[PDB]
Design a protein around this ligand. Structure first.
Ligand code: A3D
Ligand code: A3D
Ligand code: A3D
Ligand code: A3D
Lengths: 270, 270, 270, 270
């Protein structure tokens, strides 16, 4: 057994998938399970809380009340919630895995700054699959990227409010960059009516919105006579939960530093 | 052997694929091969003209000079060219297969009107594959169409000037209709920035533009837990050439009438 | 509110998805929730049992003890379990929706026979999506089926023991039949080493086995120059649960008869 | 203008696509166009021979008769033909791009040996797209390869005689290797009847055979919750012709050495 973890947001959609990824994953022990103050607990965290019962781990509201039973903090909640946890941790030297998105800048500066006293793994997408794909797209842009036509199709469930996906964009920059360009100089997002021919040097984006699709990203580099395509399909949010949980175990032994998934996946040596 | 055909536009991209589809297709004989006046002929039509030599069929400029050696006229040229052929044919009772697009209304009225003296097969897309797919989409809209999320993705080579494809639209109406709605009341073509959730009852469209893709059309009806998808992929323009050539042989025996591919494919009995 | 249903197998993988499909589906009320004798109940059926708490419906072991609070019986358990339920129902005139597979013949004859006293909806695949797709494949085989190359690819999670899928087969017969042939005369299942060219008139099958894929079925009819493809993707077992639950509400008003999904979906009028 | 090339096999399916790739590609000039002795020439090589007329390049039968008008030899013919060209070249120091497959070992030893006097680029698949994809698969196996389920689907036209594709195999080894295993210890090629669960550690292969598909290769690494997929689609044989022609220009300046596409594409620095 090992590394104890505290899963904040235990009853939230992400927090559940985390309890499971933790119980059924070796080298990591479920130390605590938090929650908002003024919400129905359910003691046995992962017990009732996450499908499969048991776990004498009880979903508290404290923190100081748990300081000694978790080595690492996994946070997929809210920027307001996160900043607070970030402050207790940084005081008592607990490392954190941060999957809360949506911080204002002043927000990220906290994290950056806190990362000098404690070890933080903070990332926009915690799916290993998406993280590799991003490195591949790079190598690839470096050969065919140039002289090939480059389009990015992403599909999402019917409740995503913003188009294109933040991953599709992330995919776009990975590529714009590698060819040494700027995504904003060469991106095209809409195609309506008489468009005229496809401007060379541009990166187009198509976005599908339907049913419950969790998340699909495709990149193609099309030439005359051939097409390369790299697709990552997400069938479940558990995909992100294994990534976060694998990162905790990774931060094991670490102190000070801000890392991300490339750090954890060693993708810079790739 | 049978039915003699005259392939106008013999040296144009479509006209070539027609000579091949004709020579290598049973029940049809290559009677003539036309062309514009003031263009390099090449006698043996399909001979040099279409990859595989031979054919003592010679690419003339006339029409009256060929009246007696072709039963049917296949035209994939220009509206201006077409109207002329339409006039000789309608006089001397030659049936026609018309794949020229882009007629102004006054244009289509000609065709409509001419179709009372001769038998015409005139259609927007001559691919059998696309024509069936359209009937399927209908049956399908009639069950899941309703309560499912309906998106249409189409991809085309880098030189298509207008987005969405005229087939994608055609796909959209097939569906809007079947559910008894109007495509213009419920179509969404662009998705940029903060979109908000996907409005129910709408039909979205995504359009990819890359390399040399000849033509790809996909329709999905997405629910919670499942997705149906119907895709037609075109790998070569020959796809349209077999459709047109199969239609000539179909118009065999016919006189007066305006038909299309459903007529020919018997899709209304489907 | 309406039609009361009894969900047998409440704590089994299917039985859960049923409680949800029932609570959140209009015209149907959760009357009972059964289970094996000598298993941990949990009263509030769909409550704890199916993710979302509440439901003063309690998971009993009886049947006579519930006779008066359910109009229809939904069974996704075991042939041995099913035959028993089938016997109580047929006595007290409760209609049934049967999703238990694996009956020996003597088994199906029971069902057939029982269907004269009560109304039964019994089917191999309860996904609407798969059921439509099957009707489409038919219409389609009837046009291009002939002269086109027909292949069927299916993918499943890593724990499916038998290859090809029983749906892929079901897809194969739908097609073999429509062209008036027999699947066993023209099916090819393996392709290894020097195969020789693809025999015309045959239907090939390719089967992928990986990760947690719930279920993917694709049918293509390939010619020279074009391909039609019809794919059904299942993202969750809920897909079958809505189908079964929609069928109960369908059996509302019915007495005697054996039906299936075409019955329910009106696909024979399609 | 530059580098002169001699395209042997000018009237063969590959030889044509080469004349085009050469004329319409900068830095390369069409020096000669060969052919078998006792076959209808057609002078203007790429002229009639390859769709677009002209080229005062005439399709000879010699070699010594062309020695001084081509710097590089591109051969996509027959092992028997190739060995002969290999012998003239190696004498008179002409570099070669070799796309003829099917040599017996004694055959490859020739090439290997000849490569000490002249510069040879010899490769199994000359598509840039396939060559990159292969490097990507490697990086990728190195992260997710392990603990993920790995399947390879390939589709080909209806006249491929051997299954799985030689690229699919090549894909399999790229991966088996990277994880440091041997493809022959862990490959599964057929899946029929009661298979039992998917053995971990194995690489499965599914093979589709239909219509005129030129060549499709997909690799997926499937986990619980996510799938990565890398696909290369070939729409035309021109895909290989640009690869070969890009290699000639690459061999410009070179003397002695045996290289392949990684050499040319610099993929070992990738
Ligand atoms: C990085 C990555 O790949 C990834 C993936 C999925 C979601 N997320 C993010 O992780 C977070 C979880 O989203 P979710 O699980 O759907 O949503 P949701 O069901 O709303 O869960 C939110 C969780 O945070 C808890 N919480 C809310 N506000 C506070 C607060 N002020 N203080 C303390 N706890 C609070 C809440 O009680 C619940 O446990 C979000 O910000 C997501 O955007 C990230
Ligand atoms: C219905 C269908 O599915 C389908 C498919 C593909 C193309 N098309 C249409 O068929 C036509 C052929 O396009 P294309 O083959 O690419 O193009 P292209 O190479 O330009 O061929 C045009 C042909 O028409 C001939 N032509 C041009 N103008 C005249 C004229 N005024 N009088 C007589 N002959 C003339 C020209 O010489 C050549 O043979 C176009 O209108 C296409 O839009 C239809
Ligand atoms: C038709 C369709 O599309 C579809 C879809 C999914 C599953 N199924 C079938 O429906 C059934 C459910 O499979 P599942 O939900 O994964 O599996 P599983 O988790 O094992 O659930 C089995 C259920 O049956 C209950 N049960 C088992 N044996 C008996 C018995 N002798 N008497 C009474 N109750 C009993 C068991 O307690 C549990 O509720 C299976 O036969 C599946 O093959 C059908
Ligand atoms: C490496 C790569 O990616 C790639 C791609 C496509 C084809 N090929 C190979 O390249 C070759 C061309 O195949 P193809 O173009 O379809 O076939 P094909 O149409 O038969 O052309 C064969 C060519 O070789 C010429 N030829 C045949 N035998 C001899 C001989 N003994 N001496 C001299 N010339 C001869 C023949 O006249 C013709 O020009 C084959 O071996 C293919 O396998 C390789």
């Amino acid at each position: 057994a090992n590394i104890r973890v505290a899963i904040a947001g235990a009853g939230g959609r992400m927090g559940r998938q985390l309890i499971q990824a933790a119980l059924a994953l070796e080298g990591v022990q479920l130390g605590a399970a938090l929650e908002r103050e003024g919400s129905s607990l359910l003691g046995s965290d992962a017990g009732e809380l996450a499908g499969a019962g048991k776990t004498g781990v009880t979903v508290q509201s404290s923190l100081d009340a748990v300081k000694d039973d978790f080595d690492v903090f996994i946070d997929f909640t809210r920027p307001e919630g996160t900043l607070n946890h970030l402050a207790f941790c940084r005081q008592h030297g607990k490392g954190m895995v941060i999957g809360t998105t949506g911080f204002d800048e002043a927000g990220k500066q906290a994290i950056r700054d806190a990362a000098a006293d404690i070890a933080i793994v903070f990332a926009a997408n915690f799916s290993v699959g998406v993280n590799v794909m991003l490195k591949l797209l790079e190598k690839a842009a470096k050969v065919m990227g140039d002289y090939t036509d480059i389009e990015i199709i992403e599909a999402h469930h019917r409740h995503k409010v913003d188009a294109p996906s933040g991953t599709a964009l992330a995919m776009g920059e990975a590529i714009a960059h590698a060819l040494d360009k700027d995504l904003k100089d060469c991106a095209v997002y809409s195609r309506e009516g008489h468009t005229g021919e496809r401007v060379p040097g541009t990166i187009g984006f198509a976005t599908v919105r339907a049913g419950d699709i969790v998340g699909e990203h495709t990149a193609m580099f099309a030439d005359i006579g051939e097409r390369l395509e790299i697709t990552h399909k997400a069938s479940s949010r558990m995909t992100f939960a294994n990534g976060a949980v694998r990162s905790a175990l990774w931060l094991s032994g670490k102190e000070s530093g801000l890392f991300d998934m490339r750090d954890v996946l060693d993708l810079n040596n790739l």
